[PDB]
Write an enzyme that holds these catalytic residues in place. Structure first.
Site, PDB file in Angstrom:
ATOM      1  N   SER A  43       0.796  -1.226   0.000  1.00  0.00           N
ATOM      2  CA  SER A  43       0.000   0.000   0.000  1.00  0.00           C
ATOM      3  C   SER A  43       0.828   1.275   0.000  1.00  0.00           C
ATOM      4  O   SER A  43       0.239   2.351  -0.121  1.00  0.00           O
ATOM      5  CB  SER A  43      -0.959   0.047   1.195  1.00  0.00           C
ATOM      6  OG  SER A  43      -2.123  -0.725   0.950  1.00  0.00           O
ATOM      7  N   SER A 210       1.299  -3.277   3.814  1.00  0.00           N
ATOM      8  CA  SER A 210       1.501  -4.649   4.248  1.00  0.00           C
ATOM      9  C   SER A 210       0.909  -5.588   3.209  1.00  0.00           C
ATOM     10  O   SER A 210       0.046  -5.210   2.410  1.00  0.00           O
ATOM     11  CB  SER A 210       0.917  -4.900   5.642  1.00  0.00           C
ATOM     12  OG  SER A 210      -0.474  -4.720   5.655  1.00  0.00           O
TER      13      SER A 210
END
Ligand SMILES: CCN1CCN(C(=O)N[C@@H](C(=O)N[C@H](C(=O)O)[C@@H]2N[C@@H](C(=O)O)C(C)(C)S2)c2ccccc2)C(=O)C1=O
EC number: 3.5.2.6
Length: 260
Positions: A43, A210
């Site tokens: 992200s 993540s």
């Protein structure tokens, strides 16, 4: 040097692969650890998509206010904000804030669509001189983080330089740069990562990431008290596909860097 020996020891204790890049804008010095190795962005790539839309708004002055419809088919695996607006609209400003401050994956996919696909996000990186960043997929498959896979990766050095240009440099217009800084400072997902290793008086704007293989990332701009700002990128990934996230490693890396 001393900091690199400590980062190497941290990496060894963690069982994973750690990448760090620090730019101290006071003298343009750099500290790199695996600074030229590729890591899955997960992200953290959302910063590039939001920045690309901001660059479009330098010419399309009202673009950030453009309503975009959120349909049930648009929802993917993690949509904390978009879910609140299904069968309604969100503006591109609201989608950008949601992508950055809540890591909303539907918002990211809408930003990618606005740019004409992952190719349009990558194009923006090339236009500001980042030849390393590549976005290949949409959410959620861009987080597969398969060892050796070059898709959806960058290097710590490249991301640190690009984040510097976007927030402290002039890759964006003045109003757009200020909006990006405001968004990053209001991030809500970063309390256990880089921020947790830094003095509580320092102001931080960051974007976490993540993914699979225990991939745990954070990229940040840091404004210390009475001192030039710093840019810090920390990327971490692990050998097992279902490994747990290790935000403590990012906090520890930041703490080691801040000791310098
Ligand atoms: C095969 C496709 N595929 C493979 C990989 N994958 C992911 O990596 N999803 C990840 C995901 O959707 N992460 C979200 C994201 O991509 O902003 C959010 N960003 C993280 C962050 O900023 O640290 C979060 C923990 C706030 S969730 C995920 C990571 C850890 C725990 C749950 C979800 C998927 O879920 C997926 O659909």
């Amino acid at each position: 040097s001393a900091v690199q020996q400590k980062l190497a020891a941290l990496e060894k204790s963690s069982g994973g692969r750690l990448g760090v890049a620090l730019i101290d804008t006071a003298d343009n010095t750099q500290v790199l650890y695996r600074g030229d190795e590729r890591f899955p962005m997960c992200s953290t790539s959302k910063v590039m998509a939001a920045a690309a839309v901001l660059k479009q708004s330098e010419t399309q002055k009202q673009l950030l206010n453009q309503p975009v419809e959120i349909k049930p088919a648009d929802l993917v695996n993690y949509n904390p904000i978009a879910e609140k607006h299904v069968n309604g609209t969100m503006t591109l400003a609201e989608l950008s804030a949601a992508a950055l401050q809540y890591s909303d994956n539907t918002a990211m996919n809408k930003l990618i669509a606005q740019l004409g696909g992952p190719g349009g996000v990558t194009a923006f990186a090339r236009a500001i001189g980042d030849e390393t960043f590549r976005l290949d997929r949409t959410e959620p498959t861009l987080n597969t983080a398969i060892p050796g896979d070059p898709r959806d990766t960058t290097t710590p050095r490249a991301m640190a330089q690009t984040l510097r240009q976007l927030t402290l440099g002039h890759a964006l217009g003045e109003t757009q740069r200020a909006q990006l800084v405001t968004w990053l400072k209001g991030n809500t997902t970063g309390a256990a990562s880089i921020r947790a290793g830094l003095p509580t008086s320092w102001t931080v704007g960051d974007k976490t990431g993540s993914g699979d293989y225990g991939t745990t990332n954070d990229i940040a701009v840091i404004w210390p008290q009475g001192r030039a700002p710093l840019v810090l990128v920390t990327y971490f990934t692990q050998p097992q596909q279902n490994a747990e996230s290790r935000r403590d490693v990012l906090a520890s890396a930041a703490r080691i860097i801040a000791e310098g």
